[PDB]
Ligand binder design. Structure first.
Ligand SMILES: *[C@H](O)[C@H](C[C@@H]1CCNC1=O)NC(=O)[C@H](CC(C)(C)C)NC(=O)OCc1cccnc1
Ligand SMILES: *[C@H](O)[C@H](C[C@@H]1CCNC1=O)NC(=O)[C@H](CC(C)(C)C)NC(=O)OCc1cccnc1
Lengths: 306, 306
C-alpha cells in the first residue's frame, strides 16, 4: 500500500538528452535516430526574443552554428529545418539509445513525467498534469528549455511535452513534440498570462478512490446524488463538469471499492461544502487533482514497464 | 521557478535491476559487478516466514535454486552468502551497466529516491524521507521487495535503502545495502509496529525558505524568537528540536532570502499556533517536512548529474 506522486523511470529518456548551443544560447535537445529536436528560440539572442521572425532568423544560420554535445561527444549537424516552434537538427549519427517512441499530444487533465535537464544533463524527474488552462505547474530554471515530458507504455516512450517558457504566475508553458503550443501562448516576450484554471473533477474522484483503497474512509457517507445535482455544486466551486464518460472511466475503481461513482460524488460534495475539518486524505489537507484514474489503477495495482 | 517533489533520474539504477526467484518467491535484486543483492527472505516460503532461522535455511540451498533474470537473459549463480538481512548471489557475469556507486546509510530526516520495481522491471520513481521513527511513507505492493533507494552525486549512485516489508499502518521498512534494518524491525512476521513519529523541523524551515524563494510570503512576520523559545513550541506540537547545526545548515537559504533563521522560526511558531487560515504554501495546506535544505538548494538553483 501507500500512494505517491510517481514518475515513470527516466532511463529511456536520459539516453536521448543532448546539449544544443547556438551563439550565446544553450538549452536541451531530444536526440532520436539522426534528429535532434529543440525549441526554435535557440536561434535567438536577448534582443531577438522581443519580437522575432524565426523564418528570417533561420535562413541566416549555418549548420556549423549549431553545437550539439551528447555527453562529452560532439555531434555534427548536417541539416536543419523548422517545424512550428521546434527546430529539427539533422546529425550524422543515429542515437544508438533511441527507444521505441511516439509523439503524442495530451489532453488537459492528463498526467506525464518531466525529466528536468540543464546543459543536456538530467537533473530530476517528477510528475505533472496538463492543467485545464494548458499550463503545467512545473519546476524549471533558466537552461531547462528543451526538457521533455513523457509517458511510458510497456517499452514505448510517448513524448508529449517540450518545455519553452515560464508565465508570470510561475507556471510553465510548452509545446508538443511537433512544436505546437499547448494553449494560447507564443514563444516571444509579450504580456501573456495563464488565464483562469479549474479543478480536474474526475481526477479528484480518482484520488478519493485511491484513498479508500489505502484505508482513508472518514469522508464516506450514506448519501447519494444525481450527476446533474453534483455538477451544480461542481460549477459553484470551480470544478469541471463530470461527464458520463468520466463516470464510466471510474467504473473499475468503483467496482474495486464497492462505492458507486455517484456515492463518491456525494462525498466530494460534502467535502466541498464543509471542508476537511482538520483531517487529511492520503497525507494532504487539500483535494488533489493531478492523479488520473489510470494513475490510481497503475499505482494501486502494480503495472511495470520494459 | 516552481517547487516539486523531485526524484533523481533513475537510469543508472534501472540498469542494475534484476529478478530473483527461489522456489515460489519472486522479488527484485540489485546487480552490481558480479554480485546480486536481494532480501534474504527470498529463501523462505509461506510457513517459513512465521519464525525462520535463515542460517539453517541457507545451508539447505544450492546455487541452482536461485533463478536470476536480467531482462530476458538468465544469470548463472556461482556462489551465495548471507550478510545480515541481505543475500549476496555471486553470478558469472559482471553487470556491464554498473555505475560508480557506494553503499551509504542515511539519517532520519534525509531524503532519497525510490525506484519501485516488480519482477525486476522498474515501475516508477518517487522521493521519500527517512522518518524519525525509521519508517518511510512509500508506495509498495507485493513483489516490490528488493527495490532500492538512492541518491546521485554527480555520477556516483549512493544506495541507501532496500525494501523489505510493510508495517500495519501502511508504512514501509527496509535495510541499508549491508542488510542492516533501519529502525527496530526484523524480517519476520511479528506484531511489529512503527511507533511514534515526529515532524522534521529543519526540513519544514527549508520548505518555508523554498516558498519565499518562489513568492509565497504571507506567513512572514516582523517578530523573532530565541532558539530555546522556539524549541519549547516545537516540543508542544511534536516537532523535533532545532539545533545550532540545523541553524547553520539553513544559513545559505537565510542569506539568499534575507530572512534570519530565527525569524523564520517565529513564522513557523505562528503557523503552528494559528494554523494556515485557509491559505496554502507551495500548493500545500499542511507544513511539509520531506524536503531537506539540500533538496531546496538543489531545486531552487539547478544542480545536474552526469
Ligand atoms: C528556457 O530555458 C527558458 C525557461 C524559463 C527560464 C526560467 N524558467 C523557465 O521555465 N525560457 C525562457 O527564458 C523564455 C524564452 C522565450 C520567451 C520562449 C523566448 N522566456 C521566459 O520563460 O520568460 C519568463 C521568465 C524568464 C526567466 C525567469 N522567469 C521568468
Ligand atoms: C516483499 O515484496 C513484500 C513487500 C510488502 C508486500 C505489500 N507491501 C510491501 O511492502 N514483503 C513482505 O511481504 C514481508 C515479508 C517478510 C515479513 C519480510 C518476510 N511481509 C510484509 O510486508 O507483511 C505485511 C504486509 C504484507 C502484504 C500486504 N500488506 C502488508
Amino acid at each position: 500500500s501507500g500512494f505517491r506522486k510517481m514518475a515513470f523511470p527516466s532511463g529511456k529518456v536520459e539516453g536521448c538528452m543532448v546539449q544544443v548551443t547556438c551563439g550565446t544560447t544553450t538549452l536541451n535537445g531530444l536526440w532520436l535516430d539522426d534528429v535532434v529536436y529543440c525549441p526554435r528560440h535557440v536561434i535567438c539572442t536577448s534582443e531577438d526574443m522581443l519580437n522575432p521572425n524565426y523564418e528570417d532568423l533561420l535562413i541566416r544560420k549555418s549548420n556549423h552554428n549549431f553545437l550539439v554535445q551528447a555527453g562529452n561527444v560532439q555531434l555534427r549537424v548536417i541539416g536543419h529545418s523548422m517545424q512550428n516552434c521546434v527546430l529539427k537538427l539533422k546529425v550524422d549519427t543515429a542515437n544508438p539509445k533511441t527507444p521505441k517512441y511516439k509523439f503524442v499530444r495530451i489532453q488537459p487533465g492528463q498526467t506525464f513525467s518531466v525529466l528536468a535537464c540543464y546543459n543536456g544533463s538530467p537533473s530530476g524527474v517528477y510528475q505533472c498534469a496538463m492543467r485545464p488552462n494548458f499550463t503545467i505547474k512545473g519546476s524549471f530554471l533558466n537552461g531547462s528549455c528543451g526538457s521533455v515530458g513523457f509517458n511510458i507504455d510497456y517499452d514505448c516512450v510517448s513524448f508529449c511535452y517540450m518545455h519553452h517558457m515560464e508565465l508570470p504566475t510561475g507556471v510553465h508553458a510548452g509545446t508538443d513534440l511537433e512544436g505546437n503550443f499547448y494553449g494560447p501562448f507564443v514563444d516571444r516576450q509579450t504580456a501573456q498570462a495563464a488565464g483562469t484554471d479549474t479543478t480536474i473533477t474526475v481526477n479528484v474522484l480518482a484520488w478519493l478512490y485511491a484513498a479508500v483503497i489505502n484505508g482513508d474512509r472518514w469522508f464516506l457517507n450514506r448519501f447519494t446524488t444525481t450527476l446533474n445535482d453534483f455538477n451544480l455544486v461542481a460549477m459553484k466551486y470551480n470544478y469541471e463538469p463530470l461527464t458520463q464518460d468520466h463516470v464510466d472511466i471510474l467504473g473499475p475503481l468503483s467496482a474495486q471499492t464497492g462505492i458507486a461513482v455517484l456515492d463518491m460524488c456525494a462525498s466530494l460534495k460534502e467535502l466541498l461544502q464543509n471542508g476537511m475539518n482538520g483531517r487529511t486524505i492520503l497525507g494532504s489537507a487539500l483535494l488533489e487533482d493531478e492523479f488520473t484514474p489510470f494513475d490510481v489503477v497503475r499505482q494501486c495495482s502494480g503495472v511495470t514497464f520494459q
